[model samples]
Every structure is written in C-alpha cells, then in structure tokens.
Target: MSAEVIHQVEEALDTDEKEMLLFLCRDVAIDVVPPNVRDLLDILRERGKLSVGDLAELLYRVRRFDLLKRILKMDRKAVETHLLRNPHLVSDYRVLMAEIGEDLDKSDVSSLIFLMKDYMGEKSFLDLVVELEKLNLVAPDQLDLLEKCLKNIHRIDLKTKIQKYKQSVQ
Candidate 1:
C-alpha cells in the first residue's frame, strides 16, 4: 500500500471507524489464517489502526475482496483503480463475491445478508442474491426484496427467476 493511501485512510476515518476496522481485521484474520494477515492482526492488536489500502491488499492476497470492499466502503472506481495498479490482483468481482457468499454460508447467513446490503452495489447485490438463492439461503421475505432489488437494477433475467420461484412457491 502506498504511504499516501495509508495516510488518507488514517486521516479520513474517525476513531470509531478505525476501531471497527481493527475488529474486522482481527475477526477475519482468525478465519483466514494467512501469515501476512496474521501479521496485520498483530499490528492492529497493538496499534488499533491500519492503512486501509494495506488492509485491502491483505484481503486481496487472501482472496477476500468482498470483505475488503465492504469493510472499507470502497467505491467502484477505487476497486478498479486498485486492480489496474495491481494487475496481479484478481479482478473478477463476481467470482470474488461468489466465494464470499460460499464462505458466509459456512459462517453466518444474517451477517452475509447484512454485509451484502451494506457492501455491495446494486449489481453485486443482485449477483449475491442469485448465489444465495441457488444455495436456498434466502428467507421467504427476503425473496421479495431480492426481486425488488433486481428490478431496481434492471436485471430482468434475474428478476424473472425470482418471480418464477415466487410463482412456484405460491
């Protein structure tokens, strides 16, 4: 991560946001257990602050870009810029989101749903809804919201699938 990016993160976030990032880093480090990530965990444990870009790089290294995108509230342009600069980083957002859904399935559904809403853009959220639907993970009430979200995103094909599911259920 560049020093400028790190400094921006440090300067941009408030104390509470920094603490939240620290906690998230700690929690995910335990789950993923990568050496660099663990090293970051130790640093965060001691300092309670980390460069957002550094955290994003670590998450990218661990193939946990979903967490990176969500935790940092990173915009599409920022994600694209990161990928462009770090060409070695995997840039397939859908695949990363699917992998995240799979990981979340093994961990916590509620958290997954919340994170999807909080972290994903409309298109990504629809993609996640598709994955969750495939896994039979979406709740009955959530089906309606998924349909609405798809419609909002103008993803008629996906919205049709949700409609079909609703029809079959009815």
Candidate 2:
C-alpha cells in the first residue's frame, strides 16, 4: 500500500463511522495480498465475467478488498479461488477492525448477510462458508451450523438469519 493509502486508512480508522473502518480493512487487504489488479484482470479476460460472489470470495480469502475493488471494476469471474496462503492477512485484518472498536453488531452482520445473499445466492453462501472453513479462514464452529440453516429457510433474510442464529450474542 502506498503511504497515501495508509494515511487514508489511518484517517478512516480515526473516524467513528463503521464504513470507514471497513474501508481500512480493505486497504490493508489490497496492500498485503498476493494477487494484484493485473492478475485479477487477466483471469477475468480469460474467463468472461466476474460476479459479486466471486469478488466477495476473493476478498474474503485474499483479505485484500482494495485489490478486489479495483479488479472488480474490470473483470467479472463467476467464482474466485477460496483458499488463501496467508493466515496473517486474515488475522491482521480482524485485528485492525478490533483496534478501531467500531462496535459491529447484529444489524451490521444482517446487512452483510443480506448483501452476501444478494450476490452469492442462497446456495453459494453456504458453499462459500464451507470453503472458508476448509481453508481455515473462518472458524468452523463459529457460523457452521447457521450456514447449514440457510438451506432450511425458504427465503433467507438478513434480519431473520440474525434473529435465528443470535449472531449478536457474541
């Protein structure tokens, strides 16, 4: 990441807005990941179009939202590779979010789930989580069961998912 991006992230981190904190996480991911914008673009060129689910999967695995944001602007891969080589990238991203202490709650998780469902569809969401678990990006015990429940629900709603899972309890 350039000093300018780092400075932007620092400034955003100082803000009270949760969006700003998320943006910082993205910045850190972009700067710290292996796949660059060029790589994503090349992949897209070879494969047709990249969907938002692909973008989300890539961002989740690479922990580089910035790169995803940039590459997503160009190509649209249906699915991004799930497994990431670096664990620290995930750890550091979470650490930075915690350091900001923005108090992400149930509503936020709901919104996230909603947005995820919008792009990933019902089946993709479950598949993505299982893939993440397999890659060790997310704790298998954390949202594992809740992911299974996604299938039981006819129309998965963010608020409903949160209420059923009690994600905010933690």
Candidate 3:
C-alpha cells in the first residue's frame, strides 16, 4: 500500500469513527518510539502512510500525542534513510545487486553508485541523509555538512540507469 491508498481507506470511514481511529493511532505511536527498524518498517508496510490524523489515532491508542507526533515524524525519516543507505535492505534488492555485479563492467565505485539509484528512487536519494539527521541516526553536528553535500550535487542521472537496470532484471 502507498500513502494514497491509506488516505482512501480513511476517507471511507464515518467522520466520528475516523476521528476516533486517528486518535488511537496517535496514542500508540507516541507511547513508545518504535523500538527498532523492523517495527517501523512493519508499520509502514501495513499502513503505507501515517498521516497527522493517523498520528492522532496513535496517540489516543497509547501515549501523549505531541510526543507521538515527534517520534512518528522522526521514524519517517529513519525509514527513508535506511532505504537510501543500502539496496540490500529492500527485499527485492539483493538479487539485483548480485546480478548487476556479474553483468556490469563498471568498477566497484561506479557499480555502487548505480546500485544506490536502483535501490532508492532517484528523487529520494537525498531523503536518506535528511531522514537520518531527523532521526538522530547521524551526529547532530554533522547535519549541516550533510545538508551541504546534498545541495552541492547539481546534476544526477541516477534515475535513468536504475530504470534501465530494473528493466534488464526482467
């Protein structure tokens, strides 16, 4: 499921019911920061997207809404960063990396770059670092440096190669 799908589902419910559900979701989210990557991933995989409404529901389900809001927002970035960091983390990526290694003539560095695009959609590549900072996955002091790096790169052809590679896979 994607964010769009979740929104559609929420829309189908009655207004009062929807409000209650969103409150519950917000409660649950704030009660405890999802303890690990897998927990966060499972939530994403199950819900697709957790809207502010959904966050409110989580809060009603568990703890303080404000804390939950903060945690959930942090986790969003964590998930994005985790995805961007390595294709291998994605269920579909391991074999793709192996095959690309066998088929492509590029050296290790170039192949790694190609793999980055393949694993993380081109538009989302920078999202990893951004999320990492948000989640405190990286040092706070390094955030500015990372932001600079993200901005410095003016042009990237990441998408074209990934699309080509994905097609080749099939």
- Which has the greatest lDDT? 1
**Candidate 2 lDDT over residue span 46-93, tens digit each:** 454333443345344434455445544422242333324322323333
Candidate 1 vs candidate 2: the lDDT winner is 1
| Residues 1-170, model 3: lDDT tens digits | 35554444444445444333332233235446564433543575565454444443333332233443443443444444444663422233322222222333334334344443443443222233333435664342232332233234421233344445456655
lDDT scores for all predictions? 0.48, 0.39, 0.38
Question: How many angstroms is residue 78 displaced in model 2 relative to the true structure, after the best TM-score fit?
Answer: 19
Best by TM-score: 1
lDDT string for model 1 (1-170, tens) is 44454444455556544433343343335444334433544555445444565566545544445555656677556765776785432223333333333333323445445555553432233345555555765555355555565465444665665566557656
User: How does residue 61 of candidate 2 score in lDDT?
Assistant: 42
Please state every model's RMSD to the true fold in angstroms.
Answer: 13.1, 14.9, 17.7
Using TM-score as the yardstick, the better of models 1 and 2 is: 1
For candidate 2, give the lDDT: 0.39
TM-score of 1: 0.24
- The regions of model 1 sitting more than 4 angstroms off are 28-74, 77-170
